[model samples]
Target chain A: HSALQLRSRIKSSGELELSLDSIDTPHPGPDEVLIRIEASPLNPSDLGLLFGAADMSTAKASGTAERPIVTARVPEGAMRSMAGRLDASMPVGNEGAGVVVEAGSSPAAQALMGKTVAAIGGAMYSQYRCIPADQCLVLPEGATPADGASSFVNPLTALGMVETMRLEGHSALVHTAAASNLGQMLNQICLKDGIKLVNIVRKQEQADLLKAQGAVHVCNAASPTFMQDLTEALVSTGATIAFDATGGGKLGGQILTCMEAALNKSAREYSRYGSTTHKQVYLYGGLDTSPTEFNRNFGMAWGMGGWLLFPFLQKIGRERANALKQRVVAELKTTFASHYSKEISLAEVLDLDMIAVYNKRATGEKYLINPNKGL
Target chain B: HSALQLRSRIKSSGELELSLDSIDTPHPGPDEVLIRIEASPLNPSDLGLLFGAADMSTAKASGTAERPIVTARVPEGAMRSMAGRLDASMPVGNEGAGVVVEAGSSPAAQALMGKTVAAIGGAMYSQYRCIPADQCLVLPEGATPADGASSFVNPLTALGMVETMRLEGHSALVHTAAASNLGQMLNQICLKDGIKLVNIVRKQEQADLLKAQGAVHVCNAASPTFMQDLTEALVSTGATIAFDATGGGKLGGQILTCMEAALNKSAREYSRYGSTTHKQVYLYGGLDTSPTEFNRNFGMAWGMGGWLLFPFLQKIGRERANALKQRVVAELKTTFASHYSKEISLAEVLDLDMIAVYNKRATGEKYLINPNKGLA
Candidate 1:
């Protein structure tokens, strides 16, 4: 049997092309298990690779009905940031779940031959994937493949944020893009763990969504009273740390400035040097493509930095990462449960119409893909 | 004998007044030692209290020949920052050295009698100052009062810079105003400690001064190649930390931008999100007293903050602070030697002409006050 996979390439002339290819599938090795992929979710992180530098407005379709192709144009200015992946046919999908149909000689691989497990291995949007057994997280008793499809990226990331807060000595947190699937998971994690989170969203509806999920503080960025509400929340919660998903806009700057203003409201003495409170804001997502603009009002006691989950997981070591994964497996139906607005077959993902809808990446309109479906 | 002291007051109507008065001599308590002041260096820290928003360009001198009064207008904009000090007669001076004249019954106070010592107590411009013996740092043998006059402020400030770098995990340092009295001491300390120092100065002559002192990296901010030179020095030394005196100007911002440019040059991968290296710049003085403007080309891995010696001392606790002070006393003549351009009597300090010259605060032009000088 041949395995079907998607690949993205950027030409020197500033053209971004994506194509689906069918290649020979291989059998599992001694320490590996061959999985028949059942489900893969379209996540924001995966979009970076699946559509690298592509202008979705120019997306068009080709190829036969069985296998489809999608192509777009990448802006010339953006090519500089994609220098390394200019001409390479990169793999897509950061996570997926499947049933292990074949196992090699090793007992560990054989033990998971008939079980459904989730993995974070790249190239998961394919018919079959061969991976080491140790990297697989066996799903809890009777969970479906869809239940574990997004088990890795969003869950571990939400868990990582809490662990990071404790390790970095921050008692409370401020989070933006508060209505995304990951943000929803973060909301529940914070509620269950007794952590305080101040949620900032662009629309009142998004803010209301998190509030319905038991969020204590939700500030709508589009409201005329945004700064006032943000300041009030910061003062009430004493949240000096911020995690910004929209890194390129003025949101990160506004958060830092608001924190500084809140800190000064109750200072014991007047200091020409500004507050000595240690405030930090980390940018972990780039939902906005514009250049970062900060009208800095925060005094000298603040810092801004970039953060990624893979590097953070690497820093914490395998023992701790596995423990976090185990917690995700245990709470798959509760805190880690994910909601999808629509589900589609592998071929439907290549449809230009569906590409437009999913690429918009509007809040709460998540899409899940089942590679085994014939649509 | 009465003690002659200088005090500054700012009126609600924005009048800044400087006056010299003769007050009754203060007696020492059981654990106190009385110091007959000998020499005190005029530091930048003292200017905050001594001037207190006074417009030196509007300064006028009056009063008797022996005791002069200097008055100036405090601008409306600056008066807001001086709200806490309005109408209060605050004593001047931050650090000074003198000979112990009298001591109370306590053994700690008696042990310091007749010994030269340095302190950071206020009113150091007076002929006598009474402070707790624990606050006095007894000078080393053969060290003159002039040798210990600047003992507390500059020496400890220079040491504090190095200490802050070590505590913050930065291996090297970048210092602006690199030709001042304190800057010179910092250059020496860096050489002895074998720590990398990137000295930034505004004049070629200032750069040459530090270069002559065996300083390896001296970049003149006045030169056309300043940014280029700064980037090269930052790359060579991997110095991600800077201590800026010109907080209100573009120097601090330029340093951060140059650090980012240098870090990007050595990056192994391209991240749409900038570098991960943490860069920090601390403003310790307000040399260019304007609003801090930053044309930030640096990525999001930087921080800017204010730093003060006294607050830092309180944070580090007494034992650690005393250890640093003891080191300053031991090397008062060598590593911590301070040079003064002119030595004046108490009354000479009240002269408008002298005030203008000292207040310019030019590199290497420092003033010393000898309260008992015959020149008055």
Candidate 2:
């Protein structure tokens, strides 16, 4: 069977080319299943591959409407860092959900045949995917492709944060950009798990959105008293760990500062080196591309570092990871349900208007791509 | 017996007063020793207590020369952080050595009678120190009081860095401000222990000083190709851990950046998050009070945190800490020897000229306070 796959390539001549390539789909092996991919979320991780340090303002559409192509210019300095993937056509998309059309000889593969399932090995943007049967998560009954489309990225990431908190000996959590899709799912997960979560949002509406969803604590970063509000929430929840989406700027530092202040509220003695409580901030996303700067007043027992989902999953062995996946499957209808502003077909993914709207990555503007939407 | 003690008091009215307080020396109790403190070094930690965020540049000398007093104005903005020590006369000096004049009733105290020992439980800037018997490290026979005066701070801190590296699973180390007395001792320890060390110095003279003492890897941060030089050293030594003395500014970040770059030199795959090898930089001292700033391009497997000697010793526990102290006592003359540029009396300590000199904290400029100097 011939299938269309979206490919993103950064040429050596400082150009980013986005196009659809037709490739022959292979038959499933003994441990594999052939899936007709119906839905995939346009995640920030996918956007990184779709646009490799390219200035999308210069994006131009050239090919016919049926096989549309978009091209943009990457800056000269960024070309050096993109040396590894330069001139290589890389398949996009991190995860998607679909229907299994064919199964292999193995009993496990046959069990997944003709079932709606989700998988998260790369090249998920293709119309059809031949993946190992073990990678497929059979969605619960009455769940649609869109429901399982985001089963991997947002749901697992949100769960991963809570898991990290528990594993790292933290009782509560503080999340920045807390009204995002992942943030909303995290709110649901935290609420269901009886965990305290302090949500930090930049806008009042975003704060209201989370608050309406039974959020216990929502602090608006835009407020003049943002630090004070955050500190009070931290004191109330005793949150020593924070997962910051805006990796750049002073948010991570501010979080650490507030955590230290909250810890010092009941300080017994004045230590020359601030508090001894181990305050940690993990920068999971790079929504704001600025240098992470901060004053070192929080003392010796504080740390700030990068946190990614795949690496985190790898840290916990497969048995524990599978347990998290099982929870996601069990709660797919409610706790892990995903909402999308618009669902576009594979061809519309390259449409200039659609690209602009989805690329904004603004709150409440999540987009999903259904490869078999109009087919 | 009455002994003179140096005291630093920050008044509630924004004044820093440095004076000499004469107090009656009490007899030693059980498990204690009366130490006639003869030698004590002016360490950076001691300097912190000597001047509590006061403007020492505006210091004025007062009283007679024999009983000198120094007073300065403390900035009002910094007064809030000084709330704890307000109107309190805090004793100065961290470590010192002296002869045991009186012994307590306990066997351990009597055993140290008439023996010269070094101790480190604070207030070492006095003419006499009555400390717990176990707190004193009996110096090797024939080793002078000056030899063991600095045995605690520099030697143990230098050893603590090496211990931290070993405990944290790092094979090699990178040390900043590598020409100080502690840095010199670390170079000697690493040399004797067969551990690779990359020394980062800011001046050519400082770099030369370490190189002269058989340092294998010395990178001058003042050089035009500092990052390249540091990366080369890191690549050569495989130093993934750094103990930075200049806690503030870009030095710590620069070390981490170079460590990541060096790790990537052998990287097999181009991970979007950079190398998986854990690179850490511990800000051990605040030589520069500027705010620490860094660009976070070193990936997820990196950590930066403050590392102090006391907390580290507490973390390692007394048994392991005692092991490090034994090494210091064993190698006192060779590996752990300290250098002092000047020796001043208790009254001379309050002299404006002497204060101006030692306060510079310049490399190779160490001062030793002889509390019993010029006295019978």
Candidate 3:
């Protein structure tokens, strides 16, 4: 009988336990590639996917699983309406960078063997994933597993917004949570391409992070003049498209209103059917746990939306994706760069001490877990 | 000494009477051309300047010299909120087709002498209008005064809609009150440009009137199938820009919803931001005296607003206005044509028989009052 290594499986709902019944690793079908994951790193994008899976408490339990059965009491009034999703047990985590270990007989997989890769499709949190070989990318020869681990998701996401803005004819973009790793990548991409960006952050520390990265326009949402600051920044950049990570609160409404007000200031009496300045707020993150509050009082001219990465990639289609992938690879060292903190082993992930470190949610605290390596 | 003439003057909020006053007959101001108004037509646009001089209700008492002179109760509860200036007893009609009687020294004034021209932009209801010489357009050779009286407002309003459509990148237009003279001009404009029109009317008879004028897509808002017919028509033309004349009802919301639903039916599942289909509803008329009830529960990706002619003109500068005027003048008799009922003289307009006839607001009963000549 062949011994099989069982990966970190969801033991119950949120508790991700290492212990599991060993099952034999399956051979790939014609199009599949059985990947022995070399490394997979966590990202804010991954945190978002986890958060999207279920109620907030379930996501909390998965990462801090001893306390993993983490319970959060939704307001008693909310229980009646949210009853439909009360029992849905969903798999979480959207990305990881790994190596191509085994491949099917398909020609696409033949050249990918022993190649470093980054896969964004789900089942990425595990030690091995039975993915289609086409979904995996071959990392550069001397590139570290760390370099390739987060290769696709954030880079693709940042580029997706740029592509979206171009398609919609907007000249610039506004990104909330501007100090996060993905935010930094977007900033570099924009700077290189001469794209204007209005970076909205919550705290002073986040502002310092973006400023340190040479970001020109960083507005802190905590400031009392947040609306004025954002409006002034948008006016100069003409940033009509905004990608918001703080999906909750009045930030989306405020952004749209400020933009409309600015447009109206230019048009004193004769306002056009729509505001001369059109705007879109793409809600990409739900960092603040508050429910998304929209004051419909904002003029009838703006739009707010959810801009998830995988869906956007699908929407952009493969031809554009390939073109963007080439750019990402070329800019891999600079514009498309990412950061990480601790490099934990597959087993070390179970150690509470390691959990305590990564779970801090501190800036620069992203940890990459490398499996199929020496203990 | 200038002879005193009897002019109807409104002294206070609700007072109006004929008062003989000594005044200087306004001679042409070097650049101005004094015109003896041959025919001043009463249009919906003229009501603002006319109704502004007196109480909305015409039921004035015999001799109650209340505040200064005459008094009549304003239209009750509903339209009473509209407070307009009724003093100074100004001459009313905003548009008139007239003949120049005097010319000033400037070449601008000397250019037009004794030529029939349609003069708009206020004071047209009086016997004479001293227009800026440059402002008068001598009507194409043989066209009668009544034929070109409404030429400016209707033709320009129609052409403005077409131009706005091109600016907004819409391939078609949706017009309401399709039986009106303005609606006819819109149909002709659309026909020439190969632009499709979804005409909304209140009655079946009104629908047929637009259909006769080559309106391919027509919806009767009074019909039970209003939304059904409108939505089907919208799917075919995909018209997102609608110019609404009946400003105070559920029609604007219905049109917006129909547009969104039509676009949505051909679309993928919409995101939280809704689809990218942009809809515009411009309130152009206020036919219904009721309060404007708006339910913005339709597509989130839409806009609604007032679209008056003055505001629209102001958006584009005067250079564009002159360019538009040239087009209107070129098409004056054929494409930019207008019609009117039997002409009424200025004196006959105050008769009890004429007062009752003009109040009904029937579509074909347009009035043209020749202030200089008596009704023949």
Top lDDT: which candidate number?
Answer: 2
User: Which residue pairs clash in candidate 2?
Assistant: none
lDDT of 2 by residue, B1-376 (tens): 7989999999999999999999899899999999999999999989988998899988998988878889999998778567667898899998999999999999999999999999997999999999999999999989889989999889999999998998989999999999999999999999999999999999999998999999999999889999999999999999999999988888988998899889888888666677888888888888888877787767778878778788888999999999999999999999998989999999999988888889988998999999999976
Q: What TM-score does structure 2 among the candidates reach?
A: 0.95
User: By DockQ, highest first, what's the ranking?
Assistant: 2, 1, 3
Considering DockQ, which of the candidate structures 1 and 3 is the better prediction for this target? 1
C-alpha positional error of residue A111 in candidate 1 after TM-score superposition, expressed in Å: 3.1
Complex DockQ, candidate 3: 0.04
- lDDT against the true structure, per candidate, is 0.84, 0.90, 0.67
For model 2, the docking class works out as medium
How good is the docking of model 1, by CAPRI class? Answer: incorrect
- Model 2 agreement with the true structure over A135-223: per-residue lDDT tens digits: 99999898888889999888889999999998989999999999899999999999998998899999999998998899999999899
Which lDDT value does model 2 have at A283? Answer: 83
lDDT of 1 by residue, A1-375 (tens): 887877777777787777777867778899999888899999987887888778888888888777888878888766755666667777678889989999988999999999999988888888788999987889998999999999988899888888887888888899899888888888999999888889999998898888888999999999999999999999988888888888776888789888887887777764534577877877777788665556435655666666678778988999999899889998998899888888887777888888878887798788998888762
Question: B268 in model 2: Cα distance from truth in Å?
Answer: 1.9
C-alpha lDDT (0 to 100) for residue A334 of candidate 2: 84
TM-score of candidate 2's A chain against the true A chain: 0.98
Tell me the docking grade of candidate 3. Answer: incorrect
Ranking of candidates on TM-score, top first: 2, 1, 3
What tens digits encode model 3's per-residue C-alpha lDDT throughout B1-376? 2322224444334345533334455888899988777777777656533443244356443322211122344443312122222344455566778778889999878878878888774766566677797778678888777766876777878888887877877777788887777887788777877888888888899888878878788899889989889999998987888888776666776887788667767765423234566677776766654444443334245655556565567777678877887788788876777767768766555543664666445567777777656412
Per residue, candidate 1 scores C-alpha lDDT tens digits across B83-169 of 666778777887888999999889999999999998898789878899999889999989888889999999999999998998999
